Amino acid sequence: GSSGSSGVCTICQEEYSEAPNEMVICDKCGQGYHQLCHTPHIDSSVIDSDEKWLCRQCVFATTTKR
Ligand SMILES: [Zn+2]
Ligand SMILES: [Zn+2]
């Protein structure tokens, strides 16, 4: 039968989104993370703009000394 896709938080697993506790989806992974859930707490500036946002796991892997 019909079947779409998922799109809920990864910390609390909640679809509800309402700033300042808005939700942000990672471009790499694809999962969502609330501003109050994601650590550190995500900033609005990122959301306000139409720029891409990456979760911590992805971000942290932005500068590697290999
Ligand atoms: Zn959450
Ligand atoms: Zn990610």
Swiss-Prot record:
Subcellular location: Nucleus
ZnF PHD-type span: 8-61
Organism superkingdom: Eukaryota
Gene name, Swiss-Prot/TrEMBL: Mtf2
Function of the protein: Polycomb group (PcG) protein that specifically binds histone H3 trimethylated at 'Lys-36' (H3K36me3) and recruits the PRC2 complex, thus enhancing PRC2 H3K27me3 methylation activity. Regulates the transcriptional networks during embryonic stem cell self-renewal and differentiation. Promotes recruitment of the PRC2 complex to the inactive X chromosome in differentiating XX ES cells and PRC2 recruitment to target genes in undifferentiated ES cells. Required to repress Hox genes by enhancing H3K27me3 methylation of the PRC2 complex.
Stretch of the intact protein here: 104 to 162 of 593
Disruption outcome: Mice survive to birth; however, most of them die before weaning. Axial skeletal alterations that are characteristic of posterior transformations are observed: ectopic ribs that associate with the seventh cervical vertebra (C7) are frequently observed. Consistent with this malformation, sternums are shifted anteriorly. The odontoid process, which is normally a characteristic of the second cervical vertebra (C2), is frequently associated with the first cervical vertebra (C1).
Family: Belongs to the Polycomblike family.
Entry domain remark: The Tudor domain recognizes and binds H3K36me3.
Protein name: Metal-response element-binding transcription factor 2
Assembly and binders: Associates with the PRC2 complex, which consists of the core components EED, EZH1 or EZH2, SUZ12, and RBBP4, and various combinations of accessory subunits including AEBP2, JARID2, PHF19, MTF2 and EPOP. Forms a dimeric PRC2.1 (class 1, PRC-PCL) complex consisting of at least SUZ12, RBBP4, and PHF19 or MTF2; PHF19 and MTF2 stabilize the dimeric structure which enhances PRC2 interaction with chromatin.
